[PDB]
């Protein structure tokens, strides 16, 4: 399984490592994938690159 996660800039490296660990666990638990097959790609976006409801997060 490959997860591409789009998230805002501003999280420190420890938080990104926790998110990768916990999303990987959530994947193993929910669909039974072997942990070694789970890849997580965090795609960090500046607030000016995030549009929600036609409005920029900046």
């Amino acid at each position: 399984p490959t997860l591409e996660v789009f998230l805002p800039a501003g999280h420190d490296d420890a938080r990104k490592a926790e998110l990768i660990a916990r999303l990987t666990g959530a994947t193993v638990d929910s669909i039974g994938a072997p942990i070694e097959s789970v890849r997580v790609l965090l795609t960090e976006l500046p607030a000016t690159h995030i549009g929600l409801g036609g409005r920029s997060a900046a």
Binding site: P1, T2, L3, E4, V5, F6, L7, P8, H11, R15, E18, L19, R22, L23, G25, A26, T27, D29, S30, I31, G32, I50, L52, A57
Partner: protein, 63 residues
Amino acid sequence: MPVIVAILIAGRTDEQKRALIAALSETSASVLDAPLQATRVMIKDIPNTDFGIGGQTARALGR
């Protein structure tokens, strides 16, 4: 935010997909201090003929 694209080899049950969507959304919301209702998860089912690891299709590797 966040928006999660989850690429999976085809074959999972609908119940497994519900579990995955719930688990990734709740995990992402808690770790990133974001509202749960804003999360989005999109699952892309990919047949074993269309995914390769080290140049070999998932089918060739026995799924």
